[PDB]
Design a binder for these strands. Sequence first.
RNA 1: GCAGUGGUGGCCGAGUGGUUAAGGCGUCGGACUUGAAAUCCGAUUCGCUCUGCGAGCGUGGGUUCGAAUCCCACCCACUGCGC
RNA 2: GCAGUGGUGGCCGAGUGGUUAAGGCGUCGGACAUCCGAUUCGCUCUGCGAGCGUGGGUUCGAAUCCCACCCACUGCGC
Lengths: 448, 455, 239
Amino acid sequence: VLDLDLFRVDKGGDPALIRETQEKRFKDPGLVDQLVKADSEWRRCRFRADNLNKLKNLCSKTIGEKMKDDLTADALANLKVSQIKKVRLLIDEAILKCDAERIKLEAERFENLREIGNLLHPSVPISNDEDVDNKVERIWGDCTVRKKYSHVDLVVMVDGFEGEKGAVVAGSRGYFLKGVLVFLEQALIQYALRTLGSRGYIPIYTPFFMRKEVMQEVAQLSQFDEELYKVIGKGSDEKYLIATSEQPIAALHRDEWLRPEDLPIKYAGLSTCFRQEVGSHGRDTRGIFRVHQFEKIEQFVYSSPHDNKSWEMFEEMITTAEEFYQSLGIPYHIVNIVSGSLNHAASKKLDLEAWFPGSGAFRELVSCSNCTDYQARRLRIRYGQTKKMMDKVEFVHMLNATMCATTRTICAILENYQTEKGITVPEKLKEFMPPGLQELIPFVKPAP
Amino acid sequence: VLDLDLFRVDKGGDPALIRETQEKRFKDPGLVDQLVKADSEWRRCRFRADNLNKLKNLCSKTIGEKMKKKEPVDDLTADALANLKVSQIKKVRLLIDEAILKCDAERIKLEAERFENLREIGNLLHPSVPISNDEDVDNKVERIWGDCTVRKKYSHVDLVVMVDGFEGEKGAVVAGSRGYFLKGVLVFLEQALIQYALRTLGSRGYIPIYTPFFMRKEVMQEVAQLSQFDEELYKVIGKGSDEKYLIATSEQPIAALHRDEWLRPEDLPIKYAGLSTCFRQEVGSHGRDTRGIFRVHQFEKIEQFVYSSPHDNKSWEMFEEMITTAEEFYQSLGIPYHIVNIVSGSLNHAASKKLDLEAWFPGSGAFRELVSCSNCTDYQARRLRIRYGQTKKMMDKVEFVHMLNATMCATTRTICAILENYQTEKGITVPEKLKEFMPPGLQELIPFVKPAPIE
Amino acid sequence: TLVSDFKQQKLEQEAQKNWDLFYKRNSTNFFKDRHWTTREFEELRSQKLTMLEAGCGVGNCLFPLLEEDPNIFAYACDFSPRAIEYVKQNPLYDTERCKVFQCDLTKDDLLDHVPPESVDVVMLIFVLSAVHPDKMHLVLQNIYKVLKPGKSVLFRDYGLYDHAMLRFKASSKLGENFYVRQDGTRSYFFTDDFLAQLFMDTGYEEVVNEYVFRETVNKKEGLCVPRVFLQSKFLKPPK
RNA sequence: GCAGUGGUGGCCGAGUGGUUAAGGCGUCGGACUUGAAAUCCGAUUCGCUCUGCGAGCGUGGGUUCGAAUCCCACCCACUGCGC
RNA sequence: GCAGUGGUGGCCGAGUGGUUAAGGCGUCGGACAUCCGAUUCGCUCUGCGAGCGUGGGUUCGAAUCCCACCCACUGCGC
Ligand SMILES: Nc1ncnc2c1ncn2[C@@H]1O[C@H](CSCC[C@H](N)C(=O)O)[C@@H](O)[C@H]1O
Ligand SMILES: [Mg+2]
Ligand SMILES: [Mg+2]
Ligand SMILES: [Mg+2]
Ligand SMILES: [Mg+2]
Ligand SMILES: [Mg+2]
Ligand SMILES: [Mg+2]
């Protein structure tokens, strides 16, 4: 959510920038005008409610002192108590009406405000078609070589995938992962966790469901219907399975005043993610590439909002991911996502798209995003530990970046390291593999 | 479920033995008598329904023949119907239809009743089970390993905080009662446990398998119990409605992996090392030392699962082998324990026998169950229709495989045991078998960085 | 251990049904004609020799020796109706040389179809092993009354420790030397002492009773195995 | 998540409104042959009061005297989309 | 899951039907290791309004009394 002072010309804001940003994101620029009218009506309503409450409190104080609507305290003391009770009834009716109006206005304003996106970084490519305007920033490796099989055949040739029985047990896209591919996924988790731990990240295993009252503050409405599973206990709770470990990690510091001294707070989230959308786009998107359930390792950073430090940390996060994939030998290019396909919180996003030689396509493996103070002010995570008198608080900056989604990274490893006799084990995962699987994952079945 | 022919006395059955077993389990006898009468009635109803179906078939065949020979226009016999015009045979077909419909209703009712009586009768008991209903008194201790009387300062409830690896209040804010964040050194320790357990089981010949966490209701009914499926399982709901249930253990999806199959007797001892996150809804606190990460809603578990031959006492040798695998695991981890044989009244319906490994918690002064090894024989395979051979014989009935399961390592509880048993005054000593899988710097000691919450 | 005692009762009461369904599923194609009969026994060699074939099957034991020697009248006994119908529908069948009839050799009596002390030779070729060990002397006595007081009875059947006995899994065992096949028919493996003391208890006299050894070899699977049949001849005392 | 085609027995695969669910392949047992076999004969979803009858062709239903064949829904695949 | 007591501000702690939510301890700033000021949200800001787990009720008036839920702790079930 944006600062409501950005929409108030009275304060040092102006809604013209917000309208031009709503245009850059190719969203509705008309939400800003509705928001401004709702906010300007709400300020009147709130002022009137405070004056009514003031009169009520003065009536109560007069009654209390005597027992032991232009009404001054002096003009009120010269009355009997029954008269004050009549006045209190009048005040109560007025307060009821005003509170109805104010609740309506608050709901309207917050409805128009949760659909306005963060300000954009001047580096974002302004466009709406992703396939042409996404700015490729740097290449690494050989992103043109092509090899025999795609991952959809390779996961079966090594006998590490059970799709039919998984769809019998769990349904569309359900899967069992078995044998050598469980060991490879565990090796990936170990290597990613050690890489991030050496950099100063704190590993954190999160809860897999979250209360709805908390999930609202970290997710959007689009996500709940479209992508979030709902968990039902006994007595019919309202919990949701997490779509990413960024959601619980964000709520780990909600309603806190962080000390500026400890602010580069970096966490390496480890969890299982649950998505509903698994829509397919050909054979090369089947297998374990788009599934409902997968393990993911995340980078989550809380940063100071000052001195451009947030953007330096953004560069550092994407560099950490890049080095992870260079040490694995996966060729990729870094892409600057266009402003049309950004979520509301993101002010800039970089995707790492790996080359798949058996599929002949670039596939997204890492997504790095800087949401600045969009979610910090919704969760009320404040930068300083002390507030100044007559000075609004500053919120921390929050950045998240995927380090390794294990299924997709396994697909990329299989497609990039396939030989005629099996899959070569990447040099950096050999120490985390069992003996017997430290040089080659052998083919044991034919390709379907 | 049990074999229905165990109750038919006209076959080689004997319901008296089922009554004795239902008494030894301290369950309700007379359920056997309700079952026997419902089954004996269902058999007559099935006979009658088959005969009505035969008459309807014969009417349709006669009608077809009359029509294809271009005809000009319930003690029934073949020749009897051959002397009627088509209209009369259709008149008869209407009576057949009415009778068939009422017989079908009666048969469906009898089937449902017999089944709801059958699903509440427990498996036969192994003769080694101690007959009792008092678990605290009659649970037989079989073996003891290590020193199970030593005492140490802190319980796991303090130790998980003194190492700064546990977030309970924020977890309960995020997920609710019992939610938790595991962080820092305890994530590395959990991962080390998973690596060590998977490597051990893989060297023994188990196939590591990562299961789905959502099971469909149609399949979960066949692997779970009434009480569990009622109050113990979370329900998942997507867009639509939603018949999915979060698994309470990896033994449930792995059981449904060879569902409705004819397994070759060669390769019959299939061993699976299941790895998943388990979601249990029942978390009751019996004191302080059961809080922390001991009883939680979500945790990772490594499971043993074996499909075995039903012949030559092979599943019982496999049972001993599985409990031995778990014992050697915890002996290499250096954790003291005793093995207990559970009493008749505490086994669930599928188990013929159950062994438990109960680890000694020196900081709590108690025994806590870490491993649970069960031999459920063919009680579940019959429900899932997992046949023992590939070919059905001419006359003999189909034989089913035996299915055994045993927890290898529940990560939270094993972490609690390791923390309580390896605490020193300066931190937690790392077990020698887990130092391979720990990061550098965490291979000798996990230091205390916070004070004890009790102090 | 052994087969359920309930199941063994079902096998005994369904012996005829099991043999009948055997002839239904296998027709006349399972067993092959026995041309070794005439050579094996010194009888049957080359006047009017009336013969009883107990357990005639679908032929396979009397049609060879009956088209060989043309002055033999034959009685045929079998408790399975299908076997009798197959014997009758055989083109080599003629009533002037054969008299087939159904007769359960344990329950029924032979005098209802053959005249007493008339038959001069009766053959028991792989028939007694299908009878329960406790109802065999019933068959011996049932055929004792139709044998001429100087005639004899010819017997070949399974013997102890034959390979077929060793192929049987343990789930196919009804008792000592007593097994059951997949189709329900049974197999008893005789010993010389058992058969001797079973024939002596019903009024016979032993002449020859000794094992016959062979082998079975399938070259393609390179299987060569030992076989142990027990051949014998018992004679009804003259006076 | 749409808007098309599909789903047969352990597997492959025929199937045409009146099957005996063909043919194979795999598996399993029985073998008594003197003219033994470098093979032959069979069995192979569920149910019942079993030499037979009933049910079953993804799962449920409908139309028809009759469906594995025609219709619908759902589920799961594959091909195109949305995401 | 039920049957007993509980839930105060960044922290801890007083708080009785009428508070400036007291005192401390942090922290920030200023003055020169002490002192002073500030240190939840809102507003048309030097003052008013709201907030004492979260919602409601009773009362002129509730942090205080009642109820529901949530989360704890103490016993039971399991
Ligand atoms: N108790 C009994 N009474 C009459 N026949 C019997 C019998 N027990 C078994 N049989 C018959 O004996 C036959 C054995 S098969 C052998 C048939 C014959 N010996 C031949 O050489 O071809 C079976 O067909 C069975 O029908
Ligand atoms: Mg098929
Ligand atoms: Mg066929
Ligand atoms: Mg159907
Ligand atoms: Mg406090
Ligand atoms: Mg104060
Ligand atoms: Mg309150």
